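Example complex used in Figure S2.
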Amino acid sequence: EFDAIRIGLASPEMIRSWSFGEVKKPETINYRTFKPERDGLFCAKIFGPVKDYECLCGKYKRLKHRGVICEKCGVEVALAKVRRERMGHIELASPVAHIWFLKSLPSRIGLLLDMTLRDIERVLYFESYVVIDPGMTTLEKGQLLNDEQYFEALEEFGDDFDARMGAEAVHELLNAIDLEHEIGRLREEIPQTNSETKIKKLSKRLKLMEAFQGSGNKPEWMVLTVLPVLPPDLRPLVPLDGGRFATSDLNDLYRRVINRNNRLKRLLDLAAPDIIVRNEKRMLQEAVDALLDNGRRGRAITGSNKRPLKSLADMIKGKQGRFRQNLLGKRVDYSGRSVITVGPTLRLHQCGLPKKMALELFKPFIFGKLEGRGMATTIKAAKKMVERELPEVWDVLAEVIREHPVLLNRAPTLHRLGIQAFEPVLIEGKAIQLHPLVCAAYNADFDGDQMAVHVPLTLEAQLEARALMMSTNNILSPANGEPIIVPSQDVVMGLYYMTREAINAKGEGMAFADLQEVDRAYRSGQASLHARVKVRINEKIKGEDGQLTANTRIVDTTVGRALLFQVVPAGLPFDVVNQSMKKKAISKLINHCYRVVGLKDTVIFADQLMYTGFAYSTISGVSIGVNDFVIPDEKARIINAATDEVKEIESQYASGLVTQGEKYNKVIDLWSKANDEVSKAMMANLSKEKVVDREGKEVDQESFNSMYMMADSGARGSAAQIRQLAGMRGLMAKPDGSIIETPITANFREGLNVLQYFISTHGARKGLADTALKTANSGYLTRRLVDVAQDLVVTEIDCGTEHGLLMSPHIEGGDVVEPLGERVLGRVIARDVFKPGSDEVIVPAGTLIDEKWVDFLEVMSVDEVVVRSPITCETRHGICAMCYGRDLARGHRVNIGEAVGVIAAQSIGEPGTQLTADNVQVKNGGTIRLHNLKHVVRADGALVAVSRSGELAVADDFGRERERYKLPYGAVISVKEGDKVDPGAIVAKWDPHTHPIVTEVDGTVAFVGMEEGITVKRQTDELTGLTNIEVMDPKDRPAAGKDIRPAVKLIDAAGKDLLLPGTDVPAQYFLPANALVNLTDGAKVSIGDVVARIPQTGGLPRVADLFEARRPKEPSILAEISGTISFGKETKGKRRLVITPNDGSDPYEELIPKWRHLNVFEGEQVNRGEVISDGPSNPHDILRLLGVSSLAKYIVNEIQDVYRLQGVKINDKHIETILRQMLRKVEVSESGDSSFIKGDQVELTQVLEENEQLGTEDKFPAKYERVLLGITKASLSTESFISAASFQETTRVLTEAAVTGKRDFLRGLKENVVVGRLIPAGTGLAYHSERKRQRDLG
Amino acid sequence: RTTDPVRMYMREMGTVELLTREGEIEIAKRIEEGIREVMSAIAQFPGTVDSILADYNRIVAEGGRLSDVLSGYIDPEEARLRFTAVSEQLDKAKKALKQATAELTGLAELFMPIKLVPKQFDALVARVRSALEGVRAQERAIMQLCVRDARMPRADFLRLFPNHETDEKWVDSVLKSKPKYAEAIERLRDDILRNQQKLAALESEVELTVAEIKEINRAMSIGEAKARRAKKEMVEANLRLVISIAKKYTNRGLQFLDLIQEGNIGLMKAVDKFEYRRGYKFSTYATWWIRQAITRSIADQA
Amino acid sequence: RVIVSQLHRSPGVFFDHDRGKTHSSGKLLYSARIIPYRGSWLDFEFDPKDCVFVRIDRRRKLPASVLLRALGYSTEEILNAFYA
Amino acid sequence: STGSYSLVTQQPLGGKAQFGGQRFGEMEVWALEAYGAAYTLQEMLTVKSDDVNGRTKMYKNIVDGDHRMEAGMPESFNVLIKEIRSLGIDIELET
DNA sequence: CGGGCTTCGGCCAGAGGTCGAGGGTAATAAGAGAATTTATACCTTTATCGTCCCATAG
RNA sequence: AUACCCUCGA
DNA sequence: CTATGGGACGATAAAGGTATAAATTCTCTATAATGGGAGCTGCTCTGGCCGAAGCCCG
Ligand SMILES: [Mg+2]
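Predicted assembly (1819 residues):
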């Protein structure tokens, strides 16, 4: 065994140790005799023998001496496999710099010499000298000299100045670094300079120097004086048929390097002139650079082809970018594929398998069984029987297939559900038969899809297939507890048609003694499928745990509902099946049955539902005909009216009265209203388009029109599509996004004109083009999500912490978006839950909330609860099994070893393909309550609230808040806390239209410095619209009026100076430009009076932005520290708003440029959490100021809005898991034990602080600040280098690991995947634990 | 910050300019002057002259060919007369080994116009540099011995010892200087003296002293440096020709720089085998060698 | 085998003024581009600070005055011919 | 079921024409990881492909009717090791 | 009034779904002739190892 | 039995 | 009277000589010839990285 794969620089001595010879000849194989030549790229002396256990001459052919090397044949006789491990070396006449440590964005060789990459490139390209060992001379070691400059320096000095050129000079510089002295000097000079940029550069210098010192790495090794050569089979020449040979790019590059090296030696040995020698050295540097990588500087090309050569960097990068196609993809055996086909006679656990595919896949199993039964003696006979397809081979094939599950997956597997185990059944054909109910999970229709089939071999593999990924096990979606193996289109249609009702039908009225009599009457044809009848039933209810009570009851229902209830298992009431059985109702029924009865009865119920749905959709000859699309009669009248209106509006525009810009909006609004009215009329006609006779007088009933059934049942189609099918198509958008001024009046039944078809083509082309980019972005996003959240696996059971996130129902707006029940279902409680009256414990502790608990919480008036979240659970290297709540694919709590991180990433990324103001008006009646409001009462009781943080809530009678609204600054509210307000009332009468400035104090104000023409302007509007004064702009004012700002000095009614609480200075708010101060100076202004009034995306890109924690073009400016805010000096061009908190004055405040509008009013509480200027928030400021839980709530809500817009439901556990993975790193402020500023894992800092507490001193513990990293940045910054190297930027991370000397302990999922070990999660957890037991404990 | 290597090759080479054919004649005259100087230096080494007499004896005994020994002057019968004269000069110089110095100067004058095949040139160079290597090795041996054992100071080392290396005068003088280091030297008298006996044997083989051999080898080195400088000037002149001719074979399955470097090697070979008395332009002869080099390079890569 | 007809940008001159985030400002009347049937492509960019820069297909941005002078226009004749 | 593999990386080739097998790419490997199924994943990326001494031994086990699945180490990781070494950066193990 | 110091603008790197499936295309010209090394081929000389006669120890 | 290009399906 | 060590024996394989044809690399030819050319232009964003230009500032 082994562990902890290391990475470091290759020493010339260790490079020699690796090699088995010195490659010296460029050519590979002689054209006359086809054996590799001496000292060539395939020489037998170096790389090994061509034929296993053979030599060059054949002197020794026996298989006995496997290590002896013959006398005439120096090529040691050994196995042919050895050509894969044996490498050689090339001795270069001069050293050449390594391309990776040169051209990486932070140049390691440049950083180690404190000289810019440009200067090093000048030296390497033989353009300028560099100075080595300055000695006692004016020249410095870092000084570069030109030809004339160097000649002058040599003439002036003569000696004591070693100046060189090329990579030889760089090598001479590197080995004279004296890393100890440089580290000491740079550490001494690190705190001397207070510049942030310089301190950052010297900190990076320190990091590199300490990495080199600790890692046992030598700086001179960066410039390789000797380079290896790949073993011949890893750079093979695959002979083309016809005697041609196909040479790999590696062979071409190696040949080029060898040729240039041989040229170098034989031109230095004859003392060629300096210019040509330096040109040859440059060529050798370029050739080695092209061998190592390409396109960085030179972009070398091949012969007679514009395609660049493939270097080793591109080889290790793999295909598909950096996603290793050989170490992660790894085409497998015992596999096949074919087109899929629906099999309606299949049970949920089994799938059809063609005879030939099954016979080919299970061939070794068939051979084994044939030999065991003795029917075949030699394997040749077994092959003859299996190829003859003798009748007895089908019996043994059936025996090997009986209990051997197989794996089926679609091409894009967006989640674990995309590959499930099926117990194959032999079928006659070439297509793979699929169960209809698993198509939804696979997202696989039968329009040409193909599926790959894989045969697990080991008993471990078969048991994992049967116990974890058998199709019956995964009924519920891992993304949300809602079922995924649910009736789809056709079976939903059948079940819906069965459970309908007709006003008058054959067989209506009589009573049936049992469901059996109902079936007997229906099959005999004496009763309609949907006829209102009476039937008594024997339902067994599971109301009490462990006690199944059966009761007999007579229910008024239909024949179809009674028939379908005969399928329902024995734990559910009949009332669950007495409705119309729409798709959502059926899905909820399956979900309820799973959580009540079990799993086996649930799969039986699902199979029975599918069978009956198919049977009764076949019995009902439902069909689509031209008469089914019922065009409403009023559509013609509505269209004519709208055409008359648009003609009138066009005439008005021609008159010039109406502007084109307003006419566009008017006509689009008119046409949208007409389209909505037409659609409403069509739906109202279609839905009730049934007139029936009930023993005389005619009556109406729900329609039996086929298209209406297909919509209402939810089987297939939507109202938006019937809007096109039977109503006007409505407005359509031009490619620029502007809605075309004329709509499509015709529907698909009437047929569109040519122009309308062309517009619909605009729309359809836009959508179809968007689809492919949506798929690509979703794939990239889910790949990044998986690679950032893979190491997270449940390890502990209960971490022990009591921190979590306060979860409350999402009530953004007037309606409840998500009830509290759905948010905390399957979660775990973090603290006590209390009644409306305290001291009464409802939910004690971390009890996993289930259906019973959510019903209990709904019965009580619990509104806000705190639950344990993965962002909590401070356990190290994993997550506790509580803080990650109930598993979603299973009904119970998660089990140790569940890779919830990968499940989270798959859950978030799977539905990506589905992606792309004055006053408050209370909705319903409820007791109004205030939250986070800080305002004093007005003179008359207006209660104007100037605080920016504040909201208005209308709590229900029970106590839960039914609706909440954001109350803005300066809002007058008729405070009636505890007094119920009727629905539609306007309790708060805010009307900002401006930035009002409240006046918390009263008295006769003293507007000091109000200059009419310099600071203010008594400009009155027309018709005496305002008796006020307009403040003069700072630049529009005079030279002296530019610096003068109006100030309303705080005085009382008699002239007494007043000041705001907390600060001695008065609340004399300045009046800036564009102000509205109506109150006369010296007039008593009431408390809260308005003094100064100043007038003021979505889809996959948005969720990607949130998961990368990006900064938009204009981020929202937020307050830094809570306290007394000030005014920003606009003269300097950037507003500086100093903050003076009452608890402690901190004068530090940044300057915000006035390029973006700032809506901040001075003289109020800063409220660090609050916002200073509008705009989309920058995830960071929220994290570093509001906290972690606040950032968690904001990010979760932001992602969930995007997902809920398309109606896809995803549990928040997954988003919180990804958030935990991103917040995994923290930066340190005052270390005492580490570097000043460093990005270290929070686990590392926590461990260091815990050890320091019980250690040398007590102050050794470090203080740190949490930092947020994007997924593409958090994934590349992992401690393991193998995980990052196979994600992205392989070169950068590999060079960083090389210089840093990183070690990778294979303790993640991808590490064990690439190295071929058992996964540290799932069933490999036991193996990993035993390995840890045997390793750590001796 | 151009990254194109061809571009910087053009920049660095573009400083030098061409020259008319009289300039080529002058450069070839410089080459001839250097080789004449080094050959005249070789004349002051009796072993080399005896070796050229032996090669002539092989010529007469048909052990060597006319084209494998001589390369003209500034038919074998003129060679007969010239080597008879040089042998008579050698014998008259050896007879009176004062006036012997004048006799060797006349010997160098007579052997000065002669020109020989490069193989014999490298043989003569190998002999003289081997004598130099022996002297230098004795220097290093004595130096490491005394410095690392007796701690005898480097100042008196580089003051009194040099240029004799053969007589007991320096050992005795250091012994009479009476430091403790001279007392420690007495343990190392035997090895140093027997190595100096070998040096004296080498000198008696060559009949010359250390200072004389140093003078001749220094003059030969100066002549070689002059010839090397002339060749450098000439090849830097013809770099333009080599790039111009290298244009023909770009897409021949080989890089441009490899082609021009092989053509450069060919043109240095051409310079090594170019004479001005042919009365021809250089380009005519350089084209053949450059074509040979480039074509062979491309043929090797098939 | 069949040669599928290709549709490509027509040779001539093209003017672009699409709103872009490169300037991080309101708007910038973008470059004027010349495309030949065969030969080098000339672009007439427009700097954010109300300046015109010209770059050949395979070069960096250079001030339009350099090209104007190289064409033979005087440093004062061009100003009078264009600005007034 | 079994057949000739690629000469550089000992993995089955692709496409009916070269026999060949379907590839458990990154997404399907993630899907197996989301399941607790690690033994089938390890056997899938170890025994069915990329292991010389594993394939033959697993064939033996299947023929005799026992399913032991001695793991071994994939050959593609060895290829990666030699390529990284040829890039002049050392790789080893801590044993 | 030079100088840290923040900020901004130009420039380069890297990354962009998966799994199929099929088809096609993949890369040239000095002769002479001299010389040096190398694989070959025959032959003799010495040691080696298979081989058996012979005296003797029990 | 290696790389590009083209076309096609989900 | 028999099994075993001891010594004689001899047929041959390796070692060295020793030329010898293959073969495979090396060296020459003398009007003159004295800075190459394909290189794309229709991503898109993000992110980092230097380098320059305002911006406080004492
Ligand atoms: Mg489909």
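Chain C is about 15% helix and 25% strand. The radius of gyration of chain C is 16 Å.
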